[PDB]
C-alpha cells in the first residue's frame, strides 16, 4: 500500500475565482472517487479524504489537501502445470 497526502494550490487575481475553482475541483474529486494514474486505464488512485483550508496561504502552503492511496502487487510469477500425465500398474 502506497499513500500520499498531496496538497494543491490555486492562484488567481480574483479570489472569488479561487473559491469557485477549489469548489469544482473538490466536487470532481469526490463524485469521481478515483483518478487515472496513466492513460492505459489500469492503475487508479482511490481518494481517501479531500480537505480545503481557505485561511492557508495561496502561494506557500496551498488551500486544498488530498490523500490518495494505491495498492500494488508483488511482481512474481512461476512455472505452470499445463500438462499432467501418469500410468497405472498393480
Partner 1 sequence: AFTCIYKGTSENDIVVEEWDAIARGIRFSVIALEDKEDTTNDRWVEALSRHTKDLLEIESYKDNWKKNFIAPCALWRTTHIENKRINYHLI
- Biggest alpha carbon distance in the chain? 91
Q: Which CB, 26 or 70, lies closer to partner 1?
A: 26
> What is the rounded distance in angstroms from the CA atom of residue 45 to the CA atom of residue 33?
8
Q: Quick one: which of 6, 36, 51, 57 contacts partner 1 (CB under 8 A)?
A: 51
Decide: is 15 part of the binding site for partner 1 (CB under 8 A): yes
The cell for 62 is: 496551498
Question: Judged by CB under 8 A, does residue 68 bind partner 1?
Answer: no
Stretch touching partner 1 by CB under 8 A, among 2-10, 11-19, 37-45, 75-83: 11-19
Compute and round to an integer the Cα radius of gyration of the chain.
Answer: 23
Judged by beta carbon, residue 35 or residue 47, the one nearer partner 1 is: 47
CA 5 – CA 48 distance, rounded (Å): 9
Query: Shortest Cβ distance from residue 20 to partner 1 (Å)?
Result: 4
Amino acid at each position: 500500500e502506497i499513500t500520499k497526502t498531496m496538497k494543491c494550490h490555486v492562484v488567481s487575481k480574483n479570489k472569488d475565482e479561487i473559491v469557485k475553482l477549489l469548489e469544482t475541483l473538490e466536487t470532481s474529486l469526490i463524485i469521481d472517487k478515483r483518478v487515472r494514474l496513466r492513460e492505459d486505464k489500469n492503475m487508479y488512485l482511490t481518494l481517501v479524504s479531500v480537505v480545503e483550508d481557505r485561511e492557508s496561504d495561496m502561494f506557500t502552503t496551498g488551500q486544498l489537501t488530498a490523500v490518495f492511496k494505491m495498492i500494488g502487487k508483488i511482481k512474481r510469477e512461476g512455472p505452470t502445470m499445463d500438462k499432467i500425465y501418469g500410468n497405472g500398474n498393480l
